[model samples]
Target: KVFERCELARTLKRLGMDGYRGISLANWMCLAKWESGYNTRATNYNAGDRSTDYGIFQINSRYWCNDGKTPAAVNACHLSCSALLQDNIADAVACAKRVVRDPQGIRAWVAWRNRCQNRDVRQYVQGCGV
Candidate 1:
């Protein structure tokens, strides 16, 4: 599902990503933009290791979700990677919250580190009214 930025922001905010659990809405928006461009069905596969990243947040099969095809995945989220690839993002939101609690915080998403950290992303949510 392709999401308009404002629509995604509103959903994320309702899910408590607006400064919930120490994550700013702006950062979430930035990460979403860079990781999946707001497309819920997005999937990226790494050729070197054959690991897959799934959904809007790009949760990785290496640790977070099971791709079933990837050997030795930790499946820390204990969910099929495809679960995150739906139009409804409740599972994705829950899984993302878990990822954010890691020692690396939101840096669990490389896109956040490279694109959102220390950047003023207010424009990402300017009209969301969250």
Candidate 2:
């Protein structure tokens, strides 16, 4: 029902995070935006099964919501699912900050900083040596 797509972007900005920086915020946003459109209650509509997934991360109940566990409001389907909904933005920012802060070390922002010569980020990510 309620959407805050751009608001998320603003939140990131407030934290001094640029999508084009170290961790490739743009890429992360790509996944998040497609998955939930910034809607915390977004769910899948697979043939009306209602078994698709819910929340900002489209995390299915079987994986994250199961075992009497509750995922964060921001992420849904990752192995580390639970404790994700509480201050989801903080979690997201923390994740990004980890990568950004370590732009060259072992935990470096290889995903974002490795391609300074390539001005096109889309092409860079697609061709990332991942």
Candidate 3:
């Protein structure tokens, strides 16, 4: 479920990601670009604390979703980590919305700061007709 750039852009727009929690669609696009390259099934394992990042937005098991394995982890989103890895992406989008509800906002994702923060992210949806 690796999406093409425009495809993902339009999809996110449809999913109401344009301004959820005051974060723009381009910002989400940038986060997704850096986090998972638009691949729905992308995964990353952090061995240091044994937390795993799952799916397109790379929602983490450490605090966002439950994998039943992370040490002292929290499932703030109250769903399975596996839900983020699906092609449908509804659950992933829901969890992502919850992520930004925190005071940290989009800063919750480190890649967004390094790749998207204070940068011109319009290019992510530039020609997508979004």
Candidate 4:
């Protein structure tokens, strides 16, 4: 199911991501929009390597998730890929937190780099009061 924009912001805020590192709620929301359109079940196959990106943050099977079929899957988040594809997003948030702690920080999200980088997106949460 897709989440409403305000609902996403509120949930993300409750996840303690409002100002995580230097990433704002607006920026994270914008990344989610581009990556998954707020759909928890979103997934994309990377034909180049036959891997997949899963869930709202599009966490990768190449490193963060296990597709089982993908040999030597890194499984950096140490969770099944399906764990990210759920209505209850607590696990996804927890995994995403781990992702941002890496060297690239939020840059690990290519959507954030392509669409949300080096810009002001405060309007994404203007009236949500999050």
TM-score, every prediction: 0.96, 0.40, 0.97, 0.95
Q: Give the TM-score of candidate 1.
A: 0.96
TM-score-based ranking: 3, 1, 4, 2
What is model 3's C-alpha RMSD? 0.7
Write one digit per residue (lDDT tens) for candidate 3, span 16-128: 99988888899999999999999999999999999999999999999999999999999999999989989998899999999999999999999999999999988999999
Highest TM-score against the true fold, candidate:
3
Clashes of 1: 0
Per-residue accuracy of model 4 over 1-118 as CA lDDT, tens digit each:
7999999999999999877877788988998988999999999988888889999889999899777977667988899999999998888988888898888988998789999998
Residue-level lDDT of model 1, residues 30-129, one tens digit each, is 9999999999999999988889999999999989988788877788888888899999999999899889788898988878989999888999999888
Segments in model 1 whose C-alpha atoms lie over 4 Å from true places: none
Model 2, 1-130: lDDT tens digits are: 3335455655555666554354454455444565566665565634443334545545554433432433323222233433334445555444434434443421232322333323453532343222
Candidate 3 vs candidate 4, lDDT winner: 3
Please list all clashing residue pairs in model 3, or write none if there are none. none
Question: Which residue window of length 10 is worst by lDDT in model 2?
Answer: 105-114
Alpha-carbon local distance difference test for all models: 0.89, 0.44, 0.94, 0.88
C-alpha displacement of 113 in model 2, angstroms? 21
At residue 65, give the lDDT of candidate 2.
42
